């Protein structure tokens, strides 16, 4: 059959420029005489339609959405893609590409959303710093350790043990808002203590929008 | 201005009947062809029903749609309704150049075990102290029900600033977990001897104390 | 405000006095909108209708009986 | 996040018999008072009808509503239009301690014969050229259809710049009115031997002149 | 009975403080036990609810246009004024203050309603000249005779033939946005030409935003 699959990066600042491309794969944007469109949808809010566009030239908008909106289509390549301009801290929607079998009907297939959102100039990369567990962090015969991440924009961040190695007893909490813009959060792992002074244990923190692979190293507390 | 008005919440129980209605503002309903999309939460929606009588093939009988055109209103009738129809459905009418999506549809139907509140803490590292900065973590986790009270205390006297606590999540346990945060200056960490914190969770109080070592 | 009567399976003025629609009805409705040639301004009254008809009629067959007949109200200034 | 959806444009012919619908969105129209007023253009709203059900005292019998609760609509029903029923029609509700209006309905439709296009014109009077400025007024009046071209002359050569018309206007005697301006320096006034303003109407032309005299 | 009056400056600048009182004349504001209430009308628009008032504190505001309503009742004074804060250029809406007997149900008596203009932060005052008629401005037994309103901002004026003594034959055009910012209007009367050099013809420009009042005298041409 055919499938469309989006790219381009997930983020982009206020009054910017947004680049998304949906790629199609298992079939030819000319032939057939159907039609492409980009669809939209915050979350927790309903489907909004941005616009829709032939393998010509022929265009549409929502007014809503008018004057805003370019998207081109290139045959030789095989995709299509869509520019928004001045985009807000209203545009944080997951946006959806479809193939449009009937124009004023449905759309027959619809492809992963990608979480195409406005990031603010608070981006930063976060500070990863160990929790290193002691004889009070401990109740009874296991024990906790992990690590922090704090003062990084913008959601997500992937949290990793021993590079997937340890899942059991991983627990990763949702990011809350800081006094100032930032957020913060930890994952955490509970162990024997046993094994405290003879295992190694490595928390593997990802943030794919500030590129930043830290790899933290967490120890018993040593008193000084 | 044509926008198309359709119910915020919607409930019934399984193996009922239940009717959803889309109503339209300016243009009649029976003008342009009214589709029905079933997504489901972190999925791509997929188109239900079409045509204002047209099945799919491969979704159940059961996904009947009807136009009334003199109220203006596009009906979806279902029938049976179990677990996975827990979806969102959009009435969608494009009318002519641009897609009018529905405000859509819920479904609500409905063993979490009652536990201990867990607590764990530890100290700021050397290395954020290095970096001017002091964080104390207090974690609350494996425990039932999801309404916890953080209050961190700095020796006797309570502690409010700076203070961020997480809510309670779905875990693989059955049950809950949170998080909370204090953010400190180094010599705020320093000034007090100890620095504890209180989890009050079904009456009973857990609490444990850090100190700088 | 007629362009809901063309369906089958209802009951009107315009639907049942010059074209009903059949049960069997696979037919392909298209209409749009051209105000800006067919309503000269001030009144066009060129087109007529049929309001009262002694009884139904078979589907597809043209009822041009002059034995009802009234006038439009069509206007380019209207919404 | 209630609202009321009123239709934007109904029209009937006087003497029959119309129907003029208010659907909420969210709330049920049955939960709280309805009430419709008729506002002339260019004057103040005025109550028509009242709880559904209740006339004031004063307006004719044949402003009847009515409520269908399962529709979620208000239905106001309109016997025998007259002339002085065409005036825009607002529902009002209350929600929850928020008033809510409706979208509007007015009265459209309740023939036209032509007239002949007067144009009047006017040159620069000499207390404009004291303030170093020159305006021409072309002005068209009394005529019909309202589409008119404008056209200036500078001796035999048209112009262009700093030419403004006006929208053709209904005026009070059933005819139409019409209006155009050429803003020119007092340089160019005297510069042309003669000002021209040609309007064409319906393939006959009209054409006035003027001179710096 | 009771009548409800406004008063206030209509023209009002962008992001600053409308100002707009509404008195009693009949009535008693605290006696009775009813409420009062501001709805404004967009020209072309539907009603739009602002809030409604008691004589005691009681306020309840729309939430679209909430946290920018002020509303207060002096009983000594026997009016109510409402004062609206960072108002755009959207705002441009006729104001009414009326009567509510029944707060859930309608208002029995509506005032007449005031005209706001809110454009651009800016006010010039007109320029009004004279519109001389002469032998080549009358085609047959009647002539034409006028003033021009030229480059003034903002919306609107009224104009007068002899202090309102003449209307018939009184043409009062629609103004239209000039090459640069201001707009521009005139005001004429249709006229038999044997009057022309018996009676005197003046103009009664009035135009509250630049608080500007012209009267020009219509006179035929002379030729220099």
């Known amino acids: 059959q055919v499938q469309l699959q989006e790219s381009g990066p997930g983020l982009v600042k206020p009054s910017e420029t947004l680049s998304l491309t949906c790629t199609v794969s298992?079939?030819?944007?000319?032939?057939?005489?159907?039609?492409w469109s980009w669809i939209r949808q915050p979350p927790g809010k309903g489907l909004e339609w941005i616009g829709c566009?032939?393998?010509?030239?022929?265009?549409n908008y929502n007014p809503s959405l008018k004057s805003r909106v370019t998207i081109s289509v290139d045959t030789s390549k095989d995709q299509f893609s869509l520019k928004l301009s001045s985009v807000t801290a209203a545009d944080t929607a997951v946006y959806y590409c479809?193939?449009?079998?009937?124009?004023?009907?449905?759309?027959?297939?619809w492809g992963q959303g990608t979480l195409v959102t406005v990031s603010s100039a608070s981006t930063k990369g976060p500070s990863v710093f160990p929790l290193a567990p002691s004889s009070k962090s401990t109740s009874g015969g296991t024990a906790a350790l992990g690590c922090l991440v704090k003062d990084y924009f913008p959601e997500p961040v992937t949290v990793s043990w021993n590079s997937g190695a340890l899942t059991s007893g991983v627990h990763t909490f949702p990011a809350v808002l800081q006094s100032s813009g930032l957020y913060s959060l930890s994952s955490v792992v509970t162990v024997p203590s046993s094994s405290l002074g003879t295992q190694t244990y490595i928390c593997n923190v990802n943030h794919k929008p500030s590129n930043t692979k830290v790899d933290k190293k967490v120890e018993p507390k040593s008193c000084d | 201005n044509f926008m198309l008005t359709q119910p915020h919440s919607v409930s019934e129980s399984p193996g009922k009947t239940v009717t959803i209605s889309c109503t339209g503002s300016?243009?009649?309903?029976?003008?342009?062809?009214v589709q029905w999309y079933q997504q489901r939460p972190g999925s791509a929606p997929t188109t239900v029903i079409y045509?204002?009588?047209?099945?799919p093939s491969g979704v159940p009988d059961r996904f009947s749609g009807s136009i009334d055109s003199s109220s203006n209103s596009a009906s979806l009738t279902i029938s049976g309704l179990k677990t996975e129809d827990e979806a969102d459905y959009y009435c969608?009418?494009?009318?002519?150049?641009?897609?009018?999506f529905g405000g859509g549809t819920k479904l609500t139907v409905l063993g979490q075990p009652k536990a201990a509140p867990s607590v764990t803490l530890f100290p700021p590292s050397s290395e954020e102290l290095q970096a001017n900065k002091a964080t104390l973590v207090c974690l609350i986790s494996d425990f039932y029900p999801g309404a916890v009270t953080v209050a961190w205390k700095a020796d006797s006297s309570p502690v409010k600033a700076g203070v961020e606590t997480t809510t309670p999540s779905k875990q693989s346990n059955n049950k809950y977990a949170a998080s909370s945060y204090l953010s400190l200056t180094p010599e705020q960490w320093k000034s007090h001897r100890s620095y504890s914190c209180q989890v009050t969770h079904e009456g009973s109080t857990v609490e444990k104390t850090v100190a700088p070592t | 405000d007629e362009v809901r009567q063309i369906a089958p399976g209802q009951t009107g003025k315009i639907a049942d006095y010059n074209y009903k629609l059949p049960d069997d009805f696979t037919g392909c409705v298209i209409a749009w909108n051209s105000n800006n040639l067919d309503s000269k301004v001030g009144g066009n009254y060129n087109y007529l209708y049929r309001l009262f008809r002694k009884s139904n009629l078979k589907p597809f067959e043209r009822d041009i009986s002059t034995e009802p007949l009234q006038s439009y109200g069509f206007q380019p200034t209207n919404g | 996040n209630f609202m009321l959806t009123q239709p934007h444009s109904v029209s009937e012919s006087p003497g029959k018999t119309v129907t003029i619908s208010c659907?909420?969105?969210?709330?049920?129209?049955?939960?709280?008072?309805?009430?419709?007023y008729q506002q002339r253009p260019g004057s103040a709203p005025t109550t028509?009808?009242?709880?559904?059900?209740?006339?004031?005292?004063?307006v004719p019998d044949r402003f009847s509503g009515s409520i269908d609760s399962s529709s979620n609509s208000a239905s106001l029903t309109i016997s025998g239009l007259k002339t002085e029923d065409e005036a825009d029609?607002?529902?009002?509700?209350?929600?929850?301690?928020?008033?809510?209006?409706?979208?509007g309905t007015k009265l459209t439709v309740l023939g036209q014969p032509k007239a002949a296009p007067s144009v009047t014109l006017f040159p620069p009077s000499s207390e404009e050229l004291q303030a170093n400025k020159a305006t021409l007024v072309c002005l068209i009046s009394d005529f019909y259809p309202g589409a008119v071209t404008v056209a200036w002359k500078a001796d035999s050569s048209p112009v262009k710049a700093g030419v403004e018309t006006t929208t053709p206007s209904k005026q009070s005697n059933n005819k139409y009115a019409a209006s155009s301006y050429l803003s020119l320096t007092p340089e160019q006034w005297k510069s042309h031997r003669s000002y021209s303003c040609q309007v064409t109407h319906e393939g006959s032309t009209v054409e006035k002149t003027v001179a710096p005299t | 009975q009771v009548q409800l009056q406004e008063s206030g400056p209509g023209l009002v600048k962008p992001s600053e403080t409308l100002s707009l009182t509404c008195?009693?004349?009949?009535?008693?504001?605290?006696?009775?036990?009813?409420?009062?209430?501001?709805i404004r009308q967009p020209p072309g628009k539907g009603l739009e609810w602002?809030?409604?008032?008691?004589?005691?504190?009681?306020?309840?505001?729309?939430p679209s246009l909430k946290s920018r309503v002020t509303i207060s009742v002096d009983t000594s004074k026997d009016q109510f004024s409402l004062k609206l804060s960072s108002v755009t250029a959207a705002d441009t809406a006729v104001?009414?203050?009326?009567?509510?007997?029944?707060?859930?149900?309608?208002?029995?008596?509506?005032?007449?309603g005031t005209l706001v203009t809110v454009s651009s932060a800016s006010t010039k005052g007109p320029s009004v000249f004279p519109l001389a008629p002469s032998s080549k401005s009358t085609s047959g037994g009647t002539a034409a005779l006028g003033c021009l309103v030229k480059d003034y901002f903002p919306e609107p004026v009224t104009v007068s033939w002899n202090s309102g003594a003449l209307t018939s034959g009184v043409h009062t055009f629609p103004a239209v946005l000039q090459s640069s910012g201001l707009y521009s209007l005139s005001s004429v009367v249709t006229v038999p030409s044997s009057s022309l050099g018996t009676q005197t013809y003046i103009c009664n420009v009035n135009h509250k935003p630049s608080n500007t009042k012209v009267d020009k005298k219509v006179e035929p041409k002379s030729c220099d």
């Open positions: 300016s243009g009649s309903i029976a003008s342009n062809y």
């Open positions: 298992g079939g030819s944007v000319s032939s057939g005489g159907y039609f």
């Open positions: 969608q009418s494009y009318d002519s150049s641009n897609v009018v």
């Open positions: 479809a193939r449009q079998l009937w124009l004023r009907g449905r759309f027959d297939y």
């Open positions: 566009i032939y393998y010509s030239g022929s265009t």
């Open positions: 045509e204002d009588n047209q099945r």
